[PDB]
């Protein structure tokens, strides 16, 4: 009976002084905004219904109109920043935070979902949700001995809504709010459900994308081992965020990078660097480039896990983006490595696939590959084997490539002839 109503009819019912008539129009509004295609969000906003829906959130004696109003307002906030702003401008945020204490779980869950859409718009509405005090009652819903006693969808919505209060930068989430949520976010990272685990890895990915002090807050909570275990999940939905967070922790200090290597992450990279998903390969090759930029003992740990042959293979065959992250991992390694390590890279077969990428267009990769050729030729000078390296490059067809490196970029043809003249 509340199916395919007109907006004028929903307006006539909500404009009535009958809460039961207002409930049937608020349910007809939810049904139109829950339709699979072209939800009429703008027509409902132009009708002036958000204010009446926000007052219906306060109707404790009509739990049905509160649920229907929360669903309708959740779907308007699901749309454009403009549509989410019309919900926040109706006074919705305080009203959704009261509904978090609803004895009805279906109404409390819709208030969680709504808040998630408001905070997901951006940092300003994320920070206004946090200012209106949403965190304490969100975290109170998860204050249970066993998260397994809560409904799957309820925990999945609460975990996605907490993820959105940990998301967006400029500004980044408030440090006090991040330290109030992390303890509960860690409990959800140890949960059995895969959607809760995926949205909990994304939240740690958002909190790790930032200055080293933000990375430290998370690494002090002891999550790196659980993130390294979720990096080995068979579910790409959990591996994609677990890798981003491990990758964002190796942007920090060599001591933070050393917690990842200590948790055993280098043992999963053989499969992440051979991953059928191009994003996982590229993201994992980028994580390897920030590990090769660290200490010589950390570069030796990469060598011990057998990852150099795997980086020679991403350089041999992979999406050019992954191959550019591999050139960067080889130049960082050849920059901070010992000579014993640089000669191991040439023994693993780095010369041919590195040189074959000098026939590419990007000047950035050409400047990176020629910066690694010099570092290797400098290690060869310290061993008196530059001639052998020159002959090896000549046979792979590299001197020919560097000879052609007649280029627009100066540093390119400058370094090219700095190497052609000095070693060839």
């Amino acid at each position: 009976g509340t199916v395919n109503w007109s907006v004028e009819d929903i307006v006539k019912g909500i404009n009535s002084n009958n809460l039961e008539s207002q409930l049937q129009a608020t349910q007809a509004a939810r049904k139109l905004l829950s339709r699979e295609k072209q939800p009429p969000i703008d027509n409902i906003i132009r009708a002036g219904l958000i204010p009446k829906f926000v007052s219906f959130l306060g109707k404790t004696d009509c739990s049905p109109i509160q649920f229907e109003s929360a669903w309708a307002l959740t779907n308007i906030a699901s749309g454009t920043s403009e549509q989410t702003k019309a919900v926040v401008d109706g006074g919705a945020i305080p009203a959704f935070i009261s509904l978090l204490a609803s004895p009805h779980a279906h109404i409390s869950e819709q208030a969680v979902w709504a808040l998630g859409n408001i905070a997901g718009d951006g940092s300003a509405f994320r920070d206004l949700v946090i200012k209106h005090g949403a965190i304490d009652p969100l975290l109170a819903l998860l204050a249970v001995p066993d998260l397994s006693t809560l409904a799957c969808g309820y925990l999945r919505n609460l975990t996605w809504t907490l993820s959105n209060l940990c998301r967006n930068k400029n500004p980044a989430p408030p440090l006090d709010a991040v330290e109030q949520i992390l303890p509960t976010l860690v409990r959800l990272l140890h949960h059995n459900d895969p959607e809760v685990l995926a949205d909990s890895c994304w939240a740690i990915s958002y909190l790790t994308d930032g200055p080293n002090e933000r990375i430290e807050m998370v690494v002090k909570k002891g999550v790196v081992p659980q993130l390294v275990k979720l990096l080995g999940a068979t579910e790409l939905p959990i591996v994609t965020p677990a890798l981003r967070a491990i990758g964002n922790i190796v942007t920090g200090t060599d001591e933070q990078t050393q917690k990842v290597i200590d948790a055993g992450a280098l043992a999963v990279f053989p499969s992440l660097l051979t991953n059928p998903k191009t994003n996982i390969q590229k993201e994992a090759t980028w994580t390897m480039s920030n590990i090769t930029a660290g200490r010589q003992d950390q570069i030796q740990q990469v060598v011990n896990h057998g990852l150099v042959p795997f980086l020679v293979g991403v350089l041999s065959k992979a999406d050019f983006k992954t191959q550019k992250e591999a050139a960067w991992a080889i130049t960082n390694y050849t920059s901070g490595g010992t000579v014993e390590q640089i000669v191991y890279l040439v023994h693993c077969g780095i010369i041919e696939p590195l040189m074959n990428l000098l026939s590419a267009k990007d000047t950035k990769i050409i400047q990176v590959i020629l910066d690694a050729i010099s570092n290797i030729f400098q290690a060869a000078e310290k061993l008196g084997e530059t001639e052998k390296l020159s002959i090896m490059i000549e046979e792979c067809g590299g001197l020919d490539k560097i000879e052609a490196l007649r280029h627009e970029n100066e540093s390119v043809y400058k370094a090219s002839l700095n190497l052609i003249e000095k070693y060839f």
Binding site: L33, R35, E36, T74, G79, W113, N164
Partner: peptide, 7 residues
């Protein structure tokens, strides 16, 4: 990310 509740 935002999520519309459908059906």
């Amino acid at each position: 990310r935002k999520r519309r509740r459908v059906a």
